[PDB]
Design a protein around this ligand. Sequence first.
Ligand SMILES: Nc1ncnc2c1ncn2[C@@H]1O[C@H](COP(=O)(O)OP(=O)(O)OP(=O)(O)O)[C@@H](O)[C@H]1O
Ligand SMILES: [Mg+2]
Ligand SMILES: [Mg+2]
Ligand SMILES: [Mg+2]
Ligand SMILES: [Mg+2]
Ligand SMILES: [Mg+2]
Ligand SMILES: [Mg+2]
Ligand SMILES: [Mg+2]
Ligand SMILES: [Mg+2]
Ligand SMILES: [Mg+2]
Ligand SMILES: [Mg+2]
Ligand SMILES: [Mg+2]
Ligand SMILES: [Mg+2]
Ligand SMILES: [Mg+2]
Ligand SMILES: [Mg+2]
Ligand SMILES: [Mg+2]
Ligand SMILES: [Mg+2]
Lengths: 136, 50, 76, 116, 177, 236, 66
Amino acid sequence: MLQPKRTKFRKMHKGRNRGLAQGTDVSFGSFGLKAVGRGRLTARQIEAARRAMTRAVKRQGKIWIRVFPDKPITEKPLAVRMGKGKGNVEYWVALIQPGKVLYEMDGVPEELAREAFKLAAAKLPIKTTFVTKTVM
Amino acid sequence: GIREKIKLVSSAGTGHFYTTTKNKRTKPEKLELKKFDPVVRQHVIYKEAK
Amino acid sequence: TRNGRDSEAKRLGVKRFGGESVLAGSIIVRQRGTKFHAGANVGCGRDHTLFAKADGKVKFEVKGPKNRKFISIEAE
Amino acid sequence: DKKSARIRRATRARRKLQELGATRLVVHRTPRHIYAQVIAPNGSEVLVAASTVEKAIAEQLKYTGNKDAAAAVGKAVAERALEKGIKDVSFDRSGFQYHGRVQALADAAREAGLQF
Amino acid sequence: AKLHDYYKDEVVKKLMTEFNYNSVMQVPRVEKITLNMGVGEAIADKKLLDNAAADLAAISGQKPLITKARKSVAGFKIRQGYPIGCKVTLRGERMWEFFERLITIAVPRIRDFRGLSAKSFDGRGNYSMGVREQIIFPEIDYDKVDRVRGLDITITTTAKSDEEGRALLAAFDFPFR
Amino acid sequence: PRLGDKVLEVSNLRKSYGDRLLIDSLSFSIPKGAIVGIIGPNGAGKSTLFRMISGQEQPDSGTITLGETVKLASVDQFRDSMDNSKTVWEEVSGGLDIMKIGNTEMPSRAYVGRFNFKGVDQGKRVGELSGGERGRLHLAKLLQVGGNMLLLDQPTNDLDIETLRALENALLEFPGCAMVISHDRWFLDRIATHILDYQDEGKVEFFEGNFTEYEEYKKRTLGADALEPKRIKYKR
Amino acid sequence: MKKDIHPKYEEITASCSCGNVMKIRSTVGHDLNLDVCSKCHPFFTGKQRDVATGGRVDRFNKRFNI
RNA sequence: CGCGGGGUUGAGCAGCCUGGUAGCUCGUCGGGCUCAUAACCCGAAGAUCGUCGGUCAAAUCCGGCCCCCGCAACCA
RNA sequence: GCGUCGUAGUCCGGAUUGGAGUCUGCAACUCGACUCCAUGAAGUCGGAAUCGCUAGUAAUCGUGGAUCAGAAUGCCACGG
RNA sequence: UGCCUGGCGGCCGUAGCGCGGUGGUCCCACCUGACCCCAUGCCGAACUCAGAAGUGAAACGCCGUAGCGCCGAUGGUAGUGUGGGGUCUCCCCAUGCGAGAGUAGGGAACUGCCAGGCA
RNA sequence: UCCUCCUAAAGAGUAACGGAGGAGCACGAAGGUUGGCUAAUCCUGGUCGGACAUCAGGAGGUUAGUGCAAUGGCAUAAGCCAGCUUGACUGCGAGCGUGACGGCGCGAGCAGGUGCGAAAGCAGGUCAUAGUGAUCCGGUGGUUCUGAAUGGAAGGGCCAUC
Ligand SMILES: Nc1ncnc2c1ncn2[C@@H]1O[C@H](COP(=O)(O)OP(=O)(O)OP(=O)(O)O)[C@@H](O)[C@H]1O
Ligand SMILES: [Mg+2]
Ligand SMILES: [Mg+2]
Ligand SMILES: [Mg+2]
Ligand SMILES: [Mg+2]
Ligand SMILES: [Mg+2]
Ligand SMILES: [Mg+2]
Ligand SMILES: [Mg+2]
Ligand SMILES: [Mg+2]
Ligand SMILES: [Mg+2]
Ligand SMILES: [Mg+2]
Ligand SMILES: [Mg+2]
Ligand SMILES: [Mg+2]
Ligand SMILES: [Mg+2]
Ligand SMILES: [Mg+2]
Ligand SMILES: [Mg+2]
Ligand SMILES: [Mg+2]
């Protein structure tokens, strides 16, 4: 489910999601799933979009997951007033900004790779694209 | 607060005293130090008292 | 809730910046540890406060083998 | 190491003296000789010096490098400083324990008119 | 003393020829000898330390220092400050005398003696050897101290290698293997 | 430790300091599991007997043979050896958290607390103490050698009756041997199995049994006399 | 040293069972007589003495006197 | 999850009191008494003190979690 | 009758082991008896409870015999 | 002035680590002895005192060498003060400032006052 | 109520029933000085000794330590050991910082006496920041300052203190 072990602090601030991404190049695999849009991307969406890639190739290739949630997102319970502290931690999300490479894969043909990435991008809430390794 | 207040009387015969604290459990002995006496303007030995 | 207490601000920081013409005994910088060190014609109180020892302009320098910030006072 | 542990042995006195701006009388005590010189408060300009290596002192001593050699150099530098004008000095231990021929060099110069 | 002169005469002319040294001082030499008696289980009472100190005062011509614990470890239930061992360092004349009365009177008295495992070096020519018994030396006549305290001896030499130290120690005819 | 059937035998004991002699023509043998109450007038050799028995004096005749399986623990009259400058823990334990009593080992805090000295009380200075606690700490300090031969020289000096009954109980399940000097006839009546009564002209009577039948032996060899005191005065 | 802190260091002349009398300084106060010394070294005899292993079929041939 | 309490052998309970020391009754096992079984007598065995952890040192002190048991959920 | 050991796990205790052997037997490993050297374990008189014995008996010491090539601390008899 | 060595500084890795060869006139370190003032929670290991038979082995100090450490542009990017505009949880335009990381590369320090050799 | 960190937008300051922790002491040495010393962790060898006890030498370069939370600091050590002592002094104080005020803090230097050091010098408590309670009313010791006709006293006042 990709939830960190032994975190220093339990609750974090809201923060802001600004700027452009850093891991914008395919490094290990030959085909990557670059994100174009911006937003936050939870742990279950990572899991649900990995069981779809794994079924498409279904025996072969290495699947690299570059993003990791490591960010607590709280919420107040139902029918409670404002104040009286901060809400309990429920799920963990990974902040995504344009240019970030989310998933990447090696060992499969380009056309079958494109099929697995299209199935992967129907579970993700941001506009993502398909990118291939280069030589710099 | 286990330390109790004690006063260092002046042995020079005048009425003058400092005031400090002392753990009467760990140190049941009687303190004595050479301090200053403004009344006489000399260094005299001060011994503790209630 | 369980938390929700703080402590009053202590108002540290440099008081006389670079180039100030200070008087004798005037406080130059309040600090907790020893961020700046005491150079020529300055002292250091028990609070690590740096105070002018003689009147004159302040000068900040990074002299030393460990690259430490020093505060000194010119005789101007 | 000997010398490295010696510079650190006498750095606080070397630094306190500089902060006071006092002329210092440094002492170097090798097993074969002993040296002494006086430096300006800044530390760059050195005014006078005397040592057992110097021939005018080594001429009279059978063995340079003992107490009777220290008394020679101590008196020699004191007679050299007082002719110039330096009468206010601060003794610089420089790391060597102030017991042996380091001391005799101090006492001889002190007795020879140096005010410290 | 006698062993020091033995060195100065017929160990220098041996080792300089053996290793083709280019200078006199390049020959290795012994600098110090250390005797350790880690009394260990003495947290119970101090008599185990007093008697061990007397033991080291007997074997060695000095008085032993008491070395205490450095780190509090609960695996052996000891905490920092506890006195745990007795140690004697010997340099010079007393080192030579102890060496003489070790390799002459002491070391052949070992029960089931077969010699010293010459492999047991620490890679710098320093040699370490336990004794497992206290009765080897004539300074104490058996039925005086209850326990049989085994101790450890360490010869420290100035060899930059290990075969140099081995050759030095074989020049004095050690019971090597 | 396990104690054999030859505990202590003295034969033809004789002692004197100058002209006046304390003990002469004294002999006995002590069996296993015995408590020996020693009684007599003040200054009659009772403590000198213990000094002889544990390597401190020399008889005029000799032959005080102990057993080969005897370990001796002694407790004397005066609490003077220990210094009035240490806490109870530092004094009894010697600063060690583990205390090997004879064979086994016990924590020092627990061992000292078995004598009614709790965690708070284990910080009190010895000079800043009472008489009864002084005696209790004396006993706890000198009874840690774990030897099965107790030589107690008036251990009931300044102990309340509750601690007295505690000692009376604790002296009966102890499997070794004990020799107690005491002027407390009521204390010794409970625990005494053998008697060492001193008399005039250096007579040291040895009798087997408790005071109850010692009185019957006296009434068998009866002598009746009641003119005990003189009761004169101090001043005119 | 430290001025009467250590036990006395006296020059005894100990002896062996075959002689080997030599001058060594030790904290004994009395020159003891003991067993062999390095002069009577079991360094050229003791090694083969310790060996007490080997030989079973030769034992059979001794039992096979028939 | 708003507030409290508790978790000690196979069962029921002490000891959590301000830190160094695991206890009672029943139950189990092995002998004895009896024609045999109960009852009774003697001897012995056992618990990582809920769990993840956080003082030389804790079952006790502190927190995370699990379970169970109570209480409160009022004025419109 | 004479000595020694002087109350100690011992000059008590003879278990269990390592070697060397002798016999009967076609054959001694599982699985015999005994001998020699060394090794020297529990054990310091025994909880609840329980057994025999009235006289040459109880207690203690030794000898013999049936089975049997070899193999009794058992069984059956005899005396002090 | 050349040349090397010692003491006190300036400036703090472009100056510090590592690899190799080097020097014993003088100076430097080990060195020899320690009874003596002096010291070892044991020891001339260290700190001291007497000296000088050897040695440059160790340790210093010299150079040579790009395995490190270290310094490091130009250009671009991120951010951002003021003024405007968008589909405005984010951006864009005019103007002013302008990183960080990284690349090219530079890289075995320079030096100022005294005493002592040698020439 | 007090202390430390973040929110706090690179001077100071800045709220919430915002996010995480501590205090209501200790020390007669755990203070002052004069000497002296430098940690964690790992590797190899070495009696009972082991994953880890003491010893020996190599790497390591403060990942160590501080009387107790956090932050800043500390090699000239503020960390560790020893000797001698009481400056954990009296009267003052140029000049500053911080508060609406009550108040709180820092401070060279002057006068009297003192400790350490051969001296230069250092010392008006502790590496710093928490360890705390105005006034009234009383208690204790000193002080001719006043003392209701005068001489005393009572009671006040002043200093130290509960
Ligand atoms: N060293 C000695 N020199 C001289 N006289 C001695 C010495 N030791 C003991 N004595 C004498 O012997 C006696 C010692 O006292 P002892 O031990 O007999 O005490 P006690 O009176 O029997 O008992 P308690 O201790 O109950 O008073 C005294 O009479 C004393 O004078
Ligand atoms: Mg026998
Ligand atoms: Mg036999
Ligand atoms: Mg037994
Ligand atoms: Mg027996
Ligand atoms: Mg009948
Ligand atoms: Mg029979
Ligand atoms: Mg027959
Ligand atoms: Mg048969
Ligand atoms: Mg700010
Ligand atoms: Mg505001
Ligand atoms: Mg401190
Ligand atoms: Mg210092
Ligand atoms: Mg300090
Ligand atoms: Mg502090
Ligand atoms: Mg009047
Ligand atoms: Mg009044």
